[PDB]
Amino acid sequence: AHELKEALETLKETGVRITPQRHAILEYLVNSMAHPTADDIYKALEGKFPNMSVATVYNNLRVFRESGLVKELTYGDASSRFDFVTSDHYHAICENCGKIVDFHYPGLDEVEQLAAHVTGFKVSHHRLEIYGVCQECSKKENH
Amino acid sequence: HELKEALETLKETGVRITPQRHAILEYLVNSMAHPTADDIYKALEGKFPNMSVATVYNNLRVFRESGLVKELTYGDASSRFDFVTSDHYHAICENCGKIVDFHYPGLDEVEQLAAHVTGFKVSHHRLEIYGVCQECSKKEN
Ligand SMILES: [Zn+2]
Ligand SMILES: [Zn+2]
């Protein structure tokens, strides 16, 4: 999975050791249909891993979350589930020259929450494309 | 195609497709500014004798009620006219490939920010929301 590759990329980038246990936890998360609980992951991995406690599952999940790879979804007095995240993108596109500039924007939860309302979709991530005319082509057209 | 599509809009919004209308819409689609009625009058009047600044204005009103132009106001300046490009919002299912359109009332805040940070003059947007549709999500629990 490019997904597993890309998550490991990020771990290594941080100086996070890429241990058998981490590699496994993450691949399980990538392969997951719903977001699993720690207990789900632990039980899927225990056959292959020896030493492995439920504690180390949580400890590694905290490490993925600080690295931005997982979000812990809490349910008051329940077991969290852990969402292996796909990231959102925002691009502005020049209709004249075709240049793309990436920009950051702090989420679009409001939009995601309603689209989920109107469509029925369980939303994972979004790509926003903004069309227009870049500065350098503005000058030439003249604005 | 833009002119084509705007006409399609008029015909359906119930509007006669007079030469002068088609001429102004074509001018609108081909212009990179947001022009004033005098801009548009000066360009076209040479081909239309019965054309007045009024008629330009009156036709812009028509197009604005058809949703094809936005009238931009400022200080004590004469209005400027923006020929609209629709934005689009789609939810795409990662499991079965389905794509569903929905409506959202604009992303003003994002456009104005994008324009600041990238330097772009923004026209419109398309947002794609990836997820899993009702159908596929029931199938998996
Ligand atoms: Zn450009
Ligand atoms: Zn589906």
Side-chain angles (χ1 to χ4, degrees), chain A residues 1-142, chain B:
Chain A
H2 54 75
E3 276 169 349
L4 186 39
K5 304 203 188 155
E6 302 183 300
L8 298 179
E9 284 184 13
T10 312
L11 285 185
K12 184 166 160 263
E13 231 133 63
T14 51
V16 180
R17 193 191 176 94
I18 272 137
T19 53
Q21 186 175 312
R22 272 140 188 178
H23 182 274
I25 291 184
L26 268 192
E27 176 184 18
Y28 176 89
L29 289 164
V30 174
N31 290 132
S32 189
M33 286 197 302
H35 307 121
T37 63
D39 281 335
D40 282 327
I41 301 181
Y42 170 75
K43 273 317 219 145
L45 267 33
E46 61 145 327
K48 188 165 225 221
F49 291 92
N51 291 338
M52 212 181 60
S53 53
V54 176
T56 70
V57 175
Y58 280 114
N59 294 172
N60 285 145
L61 290 165
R62 178 186 175 96
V63 168
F64 308 147
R65 179 180 51 67
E66 316 200 292
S67 298
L69 290 178
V70 184
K71 290 171 174 163
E72 180 170 2
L73 316 178
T74 60
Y75 179 107
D77 282 310
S79 276
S80 311
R81 299 186 161 264
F82 297 82
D83 175 19
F84 176 79
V85 159
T86 298
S87 54
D88 291 327
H89 288 85
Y90 307 86
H91 300 302
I93 320 201
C94 186
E95 291 181 314
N96 188 325
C97 77
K99 166 195 298 193
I100 310 166
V101 191
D102 305 330
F103 67 93
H104 160 89
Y105 193 81
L108 291 178
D109 25 324
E110 194 191 328
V111 199
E112 280 191 353
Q113 281 167 195
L114 185 91
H117 177 240
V118 305
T119 72
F121 274 62
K122 278 176 182 167
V123 174
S124 152
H125 56 293
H126 50 259
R127 199 231 288 130
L128 170 53
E129 296 180 342
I130 286 213
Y131 300 85
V133 186
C134 64
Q135 233 145 188
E136 328 237 356
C137 300
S138 283
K139 204 142 207 153
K140 232 256 198 176
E141 331 194 316
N142 158 131
Chain B
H1 175 268
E2 293 194 82
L3 185 67
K4 162 149 159 171
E5 292 178 11
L7 300 193
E8 191 179 358
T9 298
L10 297 185
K11 188 95 212 262
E12 183 227 331
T13 67
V15 184
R16 193 186 169 85
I17 299 173
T18 71
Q20 166 177 168
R21 274 150 188 184
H22 183 271
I24 308 165
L25 273 181
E26 165 166 56
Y27 173 95
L28 284 170
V29 172
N30 287 114
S31 176
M32 23 249 196
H34 287 160
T36 59
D38 292 4
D39 283 333
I40 290 155
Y41 171 89
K42 292 177 181 152
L44 303 186
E45 58 84 353
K47 34 145 168 186
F48 294 98
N50 307 321
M51 176 189 304
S52 54
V53 163
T55 241
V56 173
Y57 269 113
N58 289 173
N59 283 140
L60 291 169
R61 159 168 203 124
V62 182
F63 302 158
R64 183 183 34 87
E65 290 168 351
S66 298
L68 285 175
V69 195
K70 263 314 331 134
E71 181 175 1
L72 289 178
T73 52
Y74 180 88
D76 306 272
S78 303
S79 305
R80 270 170 182 270
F81 303 87
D82 184 17
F83 178 72
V84 176
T85 303
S86 308
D87 308 304
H88 284 285
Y89 306 87
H90 310 121
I92 316 201
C93 183
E94 276 174 317
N95 285 28
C96 73
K98 187 192 301 158
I99 295 181
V100 171
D101 300 341
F102 55 107
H103 168 75
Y104 190 85
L107 302 169
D108 57 2
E109 200 185 318
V110 200
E111 289 209 355
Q112 286 145 179
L113 188 75
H116 173 237
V117 316
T118 65
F120 266 54
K121 204 163 273 157
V122 183
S123 196
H124 58 286
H125 59 261
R126 182 256 255 127
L127 171 76
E128 283 182 334
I129 283 189
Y130 302 92
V132 178
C133 62
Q134 216 145 228
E135 274 192 349
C136 285
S137 169
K138 186 186 189 137
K139 223 193 172 226
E140 303 160 0
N141 216 18

